[PDB]
């Protein structure tokens, strides 16, 4: 159905999302601050354990996607009575993947959040085809061709949308 | 396991405040908003409100604002209506809803009954009446009351008349069956009637 | 809020009939628009979700249709089982219902079987049986004399299967304006009778 999807205990999707994810990271090197742009690849899975459609006082629903050598792109949600949206993107990459990271004079993990401005109505899906940004630290996060949903009560994307502000 | 348990009946006075719960369970609580919907015969069906339970967020309708107040409590899976300055027009069942916005997925609860009255709990008398055959549950107070015929065995034939308004504020209905002719000196006829609200329970035999 | 304006209040119609509910709302509703059936006792159920789906466990005789402000529920053959308070309801923008239609099943004509029961204070019952239509006159007399105001009516919903109605009319009077009479009638007017049938004692 979707190329990112959270599952309810019924097998339901709960979180349902398409996107292709363009980063673009400024790292430490042993020459210098360079520049790395890369894509989400198309080998990227949702972490089983990671991910959640919420729990009763404890957790928040959450998509997590694990990519490349030991790296996840989690967009966390938060609801009132008529909208959501993804009020945290946390990117954690490991900067001892030489094949994203070459030169680098960490081999650290790093972990980088920020608000977002994904958000729409509750009973729509988020829309955005030309590409919502993230700024974090260092990091640039471009998620292309959007359509994202949370809260859902059934494996499918309603037929409502909130597109986002930069597609008019 | 989808399940939306409200809180029993309510007999309130005039002016008087009222407080209803509605208990979720078998989904995740703050998934979904609980909506409150009035269901009378005089207005038919009304929305008055949601809440988001988790936030507390709770959208109200034009005419139900500050009448309705909706609360909620994570802890216990626990949503509250309050109603002020209860009328006569207030008297109606409430429905708790499980429900985003689409209709597609809500649930409804059982109901809870109010009723608005200045009245005293109190319980009916159980008078008795092809041949046709009844009794008469008269003045008892508040609604409702459960009239069957031989413990449940005669079924065909019954009408249980939807109560009345006497103008003293009590309630005053009958229970009617049609028999043959012929079944009168053989079968016998019992009318249970249970006033669960005063936990008056009257068995009446019919004979002439 | 938005307004729901549904239309008619009321209709009778037979089955096998096509019956037609319309609503309009106030404002452009997005084909959020969903058709309930109420049923006493029971809280509303579902028929039709975004104009035209039909919910699972609903037959297919109930279909929906509209579009930016105008929608209708239609039942194309009418059952027995129909007889309902039909509402429509947007959740386009919060939730706001219609306000109603009352659907009544139309048949051939019963006639009322009449008993009546003899009567603190007084209260002497007359009860109509099965009758179809629901129009039907009681009128109290003791000692021919029309009494007015100290009688109230009660009705039974239409039959699952016949679509027939009973009636009680209670006469309530003090047992000393009661006790001097001796002549109580229960004269009845309906379709179904030629002429008005009095069952008294």
């Known amino acids: 159905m979707a190329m990112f999807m959270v599952k309810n205990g019924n097998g339901t999707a709960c979180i349902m999302a398409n996107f292709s994810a363009a980063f673009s990271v400024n790292y430490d090197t042993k020459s210098g601050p360079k520049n790395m742009t890369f894509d989400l690849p198309s080998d990227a899975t949702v972490v089983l354990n990671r991910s959640s459609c919420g729990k009763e006082n404890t957790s928040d629903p959450s998509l997590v996607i694990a990519f490349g050598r030991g790296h996840t792109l989690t967009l966390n949600f938060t609801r009132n009575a008529t909208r959501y949206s993804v009020q945290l993107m946390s990117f954690v990459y490991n900067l001892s993947d030489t094949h994203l990271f070459p030169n680098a004079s960490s081999k650290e993990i790093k972990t980088v959040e920020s608000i977002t401005d994904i958000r729409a109505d509750i009973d729509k899906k988020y829309r955005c085809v030309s590409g919502t940004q993230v700024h974090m630290n260092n990091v640039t996060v471009t998620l292309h061709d959007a359509t994202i949903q949370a809260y859902l009560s059934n494996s499918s994307f309603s037929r409502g949308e909130t597109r986002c502000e930069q597609d008019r | 396991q989808v399940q939306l348990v409200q809180s029993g009946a309510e007999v309130k006075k005039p002016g008087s405040s009222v407080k209803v719960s509605c208990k979720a369970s078998?989904?995740?609580?703050?998934?979904?908003?609980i909506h409150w919907v009035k269901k009378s015969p005089g207005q038919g069906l009304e929305w008055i409100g949601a809440?988001?339970?988790?936030?507390?967020?709770?959208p109200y309708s034009q005419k139900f604002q500050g009448k309705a107040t909706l609360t909620a409590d994570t802890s216990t899976s626990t949503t509250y209506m309050e109603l002020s300055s209860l009328r006569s027009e207030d008297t109606a069942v409430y429905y708790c809803?499980?429900?985003?916005?689409?209709?597609?997925?809500?649930?409804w609860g059982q109901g809870t009954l109010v009723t608005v009255s200045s009245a005293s709990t109190k319980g009916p008398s159980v008078f008795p009446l092809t041949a046709a055959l009844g009794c008469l549950v008269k003045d008892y107070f508040p609604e409702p009351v459960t009239v069957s015929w031989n413990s449940g065995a005669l079924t065909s034939g019954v009408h249980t008349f939807p109560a009345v308004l006497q103008s003293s504020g009590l309630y005053s209905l009958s229970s009617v069956v049609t028999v043959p002719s012929s079944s009168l000196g053989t079968q016998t006829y019992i009318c249970n009637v249970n006033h669960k609200p005063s936990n008056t329970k009257v068995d009446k035999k019919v004979e002439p | 809020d938005i307004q729901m304006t549904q239309s008619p209040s009321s209709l009778s119609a037979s089955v096998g009939d096509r019956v037609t509910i319309t609503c309009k709302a106030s404002q452009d509703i997005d084909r959020y628009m969903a058709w309930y059936q109420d049923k006493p006792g029971k809280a509303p159920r579902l028929l039709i979700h975004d104009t035209s789906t039909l919910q699972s466990g609903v037959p297919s005789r109930f279909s929906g249709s509209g579009s930016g402000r105008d929608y209708t529920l239609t039942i194309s053959n009418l059952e027995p089982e129909d007889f309902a308070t039909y509402y429509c309801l947007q959740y386009d923008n919060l939730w706001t219902f219609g306000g109603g239609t009352k659907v009544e099943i139309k048949r051939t004509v019963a006639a009322p079987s009449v008993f009546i029961f003899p009567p603190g204070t007084a209260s002497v019952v007359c009860l109509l049986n099965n009758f179809y239509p629901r129009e039907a006159k009681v009128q109290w007399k003791v000692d021919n004399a029309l009494q007015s105001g100290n009688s109230q009516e009660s009705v039974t919903e239409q039959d699952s299967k016949d679509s027939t109605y009973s009636l009680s009319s209670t006469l309530t009077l003090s047992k000393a304006d009661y006790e001097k009479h001796k002549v109580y009638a229960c004269e009845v007017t309906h379709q179904g009778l030629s002429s008005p049938v009095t069952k008294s004692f």
């Open positions: 809803v499980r429900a985003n916005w689409d209709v597609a997925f809500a649930y």
């Open positions: 809440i988001y339970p988790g936030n507390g967020d709770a």
């Open positions: 078998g989904y995740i609580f703050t998934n979904y908003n």
